[PDB]
Amino acid sequence: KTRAKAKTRSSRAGLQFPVGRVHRLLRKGNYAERVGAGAPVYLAAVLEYLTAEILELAGNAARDNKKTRIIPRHLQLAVRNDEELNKLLGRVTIAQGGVLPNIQSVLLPKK
Amino acid sequence: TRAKAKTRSSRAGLQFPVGRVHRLLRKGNYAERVGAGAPVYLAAVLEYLTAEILELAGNAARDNKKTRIIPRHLQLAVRNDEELNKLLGRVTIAQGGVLPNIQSVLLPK
Amino acid sequence: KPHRYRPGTVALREIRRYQKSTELLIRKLPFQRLVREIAQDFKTDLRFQSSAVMALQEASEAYLVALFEDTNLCAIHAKRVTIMPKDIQLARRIRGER
Amino acid sequence: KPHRYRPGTVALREIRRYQKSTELLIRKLPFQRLVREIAQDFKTDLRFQSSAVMALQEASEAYLVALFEDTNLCAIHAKRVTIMPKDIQLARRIRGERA
Amino acid sequence: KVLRDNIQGITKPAIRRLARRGGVKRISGLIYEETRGVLKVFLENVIRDAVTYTEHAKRKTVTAMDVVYALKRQGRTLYGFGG
Amino acid sequence: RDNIQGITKPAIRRLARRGGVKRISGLIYEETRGVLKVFLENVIRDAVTYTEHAKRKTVTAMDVVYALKRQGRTLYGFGG
Amino acid sequence: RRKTRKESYAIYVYKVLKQVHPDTGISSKAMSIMNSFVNDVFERIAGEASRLAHYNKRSTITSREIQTAVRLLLPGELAKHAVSEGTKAVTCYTSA
Amino acid sequence: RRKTRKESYAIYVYKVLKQVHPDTGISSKAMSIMNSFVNDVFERIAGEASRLAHYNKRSTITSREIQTAVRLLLPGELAKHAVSEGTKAVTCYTSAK
Amino acid sequence: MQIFVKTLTGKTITLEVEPSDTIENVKAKIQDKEGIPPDQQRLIFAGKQLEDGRTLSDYNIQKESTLHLVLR
DNA sequence: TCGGATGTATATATCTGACACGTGCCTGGAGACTAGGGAGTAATCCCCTTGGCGGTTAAAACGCGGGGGACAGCGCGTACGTGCGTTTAAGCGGTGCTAGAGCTGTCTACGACCAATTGAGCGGCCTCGGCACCGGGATTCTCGA
DNA sequence: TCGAGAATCCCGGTGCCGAGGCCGCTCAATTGGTCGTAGACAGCTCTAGCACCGCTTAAACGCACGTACGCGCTGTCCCCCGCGTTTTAACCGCCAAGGGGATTACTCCCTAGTCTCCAGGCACGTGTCAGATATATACATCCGA
């Protein structure tokens, strides 16, 4: 009767996001009567993938401007320049973001 | 012995089922517990809205010398009132149609 | 000698006539064939209920009518009577679609 | 003779300068006072957290910038360069906001 | 049976009738192709969503409820067909 | 209390310049002021309703985010 | 070999219609449209009430949540009249 | 002094960032924005899954509902990649014990 | 030098390697002392995937370094 | 500015298919009782909001010269509206047939719930390096001749 | 076409404050075990979706003709733009006071759950009349002399 050493559920799935916290939030969120044993793994994997994509693009954009930290402008530049992510966050405004540097062609000086 | 049963809608003086609304609230996965006053409020609000729309539609139909109500009358009643149009701004009604308006520029001289 | 109306009268007549009625405008069978051909690309050997086709036709007709109204407004804004493709493009761009 | 630029160059310079950066554009105190005056009607003796005022300012600025972009497109469509109130009205009507 | 070239079934007079109901008075000669493309895109999106919905239920027949749900999910809900 | 006049003409000019406008007519300012007033009234009404239901006396930053999210205008970075 | 039971709102809509206009009928499609309208509105109000209750760290929904959700959803005059009707109905039910 | 504990996805976001870019920092505002983004996506997916389960008169949320909701919300390429990642994670969790 | 390679099961093995030694030499020694085929060895040190064409000095893998191994 | 020709509105018979209504019944709602935790209320602490005063400095406000842009007017020719004869396939009415939606048993694997416990995650402190700021020079633009 | 002024960028030096990391500990995720039912699979029944064939006629198609509208071009007048001078209030720093938000403990009562009983809402079947068609006639409107 010796209990085995504890292993986090995220460790078995080879993930980084917490499986147990997601499971608790699903159970306490008033979504359904009962929750299966596989949904938290799927949700954690999806969230991790999306976070990794966003962070990679933002880091590339920050490295472009010779900076070692990420600020909201870098996140805005990363999001707005990818059509897929721009379509995802269509109706979301980011604080301290700014706009893309574009100008209409006709307004340019003649000659 | 036991006393005779009286429906809760009769006690509240309504025409919509209070018990059915209570059951739908309980089984709809909205909250852990449901109070005893929400169904009455919900039924009253729904009855008021239904009565308003039905009155407007009946008036519109009677303007067209008809005895029954068809979807065109409902569309005319909804689109010709401000607040009702605002409430249903993203809803399309089957067999409805449109409102008879023409831009003034296209009219002949 | 033959009686001919001036250009524009018949257009207004049809405008009034088709704004007074509520029946469908597109034919049924070609629309059903189009729907089946489009749906063939996602899963083969599919079957449809008639009410589904009717609902699709109603929604598409309403969408097209609203788009044409917006296009007419855009065309009128620029001192014109005739609608042109750039009006449709501008309306779609402003509405928030890609 | 004093050195003067032709009309239009400074406008493009201002466009580049203000669209490169990411600061706010409206003075804080007048906006806070306006928010307080507007909210006074709905309920008397209210109080505000500073972050709420900041959020309101950010949202308003974003909305105005987007509206101006759409208005500029509408103006350009009609073979012009200067925006006019009718352009704002047309953009608001098409967007579905104005009834 | 595999069916090809049904987009041309939307004849020019049908588009003209739709425009007349919309309030248009004069029509240019290049509108029809643009209208056909727009309609094709719209149908593609709605049909994709409905087919996904009917796939989840392990069925093989698309019902009206799937179309209603797919239309609602895009914020253009439809009344008069159940639900 | 004519505090709507605090939105000076140069501020509107700066906003338009960021938007991408090159020439501005002399009657834009009134329209801009009216539009901003309407938007602020709607948002503040919703936020005050939320605060009143919460049974408090000072509006928080959270109910502003909630009111904005209700109108399909989600905002990021303010404790959402 | 009979079918299963399908619940609906037809009887109550007919009762209200006969209360308002005593000499007017209604066809089937209009009844379906009204049924859809009732279901839609019920869903919106219930969802808003649930979110409001979750926001304030509560585990129940009472008349106050419904009243606030109604005030949030509907425009001005409709909100005022509906609030008055709901309050009157609740008071009349409690008194009996 | 008594302080209530607040939960956030800050540590996991930092772990992912250090996994992708070995040498790059992040400020507090960016962390708050990422926390809000994660919460928003979680809420959307969970609500879609709940509605989808309720449509088919069932009482359980399983991986199939999550997969269908993900395919419904995300566009094409993102949906494909997310589906692959979720399937791989679930298989790895099941095979091990 | 001596380096540490930690497997997926929580076991750390010691490799008597050199900075000039390629990652393929590390894989060969790991296979010799544990039986893990080089093609099934997935390696990270300092957040960099280890490539057989590169050496231990390329990844700045020095003595007493900690390396993570996956056999999936 | 009149008058002929065309399309639309108005009045009457008539026949059919959908609406309104009467039954049977069976499942869902109502009456009576218990028990147990969620929510209302009182008391306390201290943190954050509001208010006032001085300076200082950058931004707001006002006036003027002028050049480019909005707008009206004119001419042309070309694409689109209208009408007629010809060709095509949509629409309606039947008749067959079977794939698949829908309902009933059953039986087992999976999720909820509970007690002990122990390692992950959050609050507090600090320390030092990345980024902000100022001064200077090289560079890249624009406008008059 | 070419050169004289302004605005912008790259480089170097200096200083500050917040981001990355370490400790301590308390509450939530793990582990082991029991029990009840949600749903997966098999079987059967009946409907409605698919396919074919014939006929009728309304709608789509193609062609000819004329005209009105889209578009380029020119001239005028005036109204925003760039620049200089004067005025003001925003902003930063500091100092005081207190109201309302955030916890903590205690207690009554409001709701979930169970059993028993009966009546209201739904599926089914039927009659009859509101309105959709067909026919004829009166009236409003458009375009040429």
Numbering used by the authors:
A (entry chain C): 9 to 119
B (entry chain G): 10 to 118
C (entry chain A): 37 to 134
D (entry chain E): 37 to 135
E (entry chain B): 20 to 102
F (entry chain F): 23 to 102
G (entry chain H): 26 to 121
H (entry chain D): 26 to 122
What does the report in the manuscript say about this coordinate set?
To investigate whether H2BK120ub adopts positions that could interfere with the binding of proteins that interact with the nucleosome acidic patch, we determined cryoEM structures of nucleosome core particles containing Widom 601 DNA (147 bp) and ubiquitinated histone H2B-K120. The density maps revealed four distinct positions of ubiquitin on the nucleosome surface, denoted H2Bub positions 1, 2, 3, and 4. In H2Bub position 1, ubiquitin sits nearest the center of the histone octamer core, and progressively further away in positions 2–4. The global resolution estimates for the EM maps for H2Bub positions 1, 2, 3, and 4 were calculated to be 3.32, 3.33, 3.34, and 3.36 Å, respectively. The local resolution of the nucleosome core, at ∼3 Å, was higher than that of the conjugated ubiquitin, at ∼6 Å, indicating greater conformational heterogeneity of the ubiquitin compared to the nucleosome core. The secondary structure elements of ubiquitin in H2Bub positions 1–3 were sufficiently resolved to unambiguously position and orient the ubiquitin within the electron density maps. In all three positions, the ubiquitin beta sheet is oriented towards the nucleosome surface, while the alpha helix faces away. Given its proximity to the other positions, we modeled the ubiquitin in H2Bub position 4 in a similar orientation relative to the nucleosome surface. To visualize representative structures in the MD simulation, we used K-means clustering of ubiquitin throughout the trajectory to obtain representative snapshots consistent with H2Bub positions 3, 4, and 5. Although our MD simulations were able to recapitulate H2Bub positions 3, 4, and 5 observed in our cryoEM maps, we did not capture positions 1, 2, and 6, suggesting that further sampling is required to observe them.
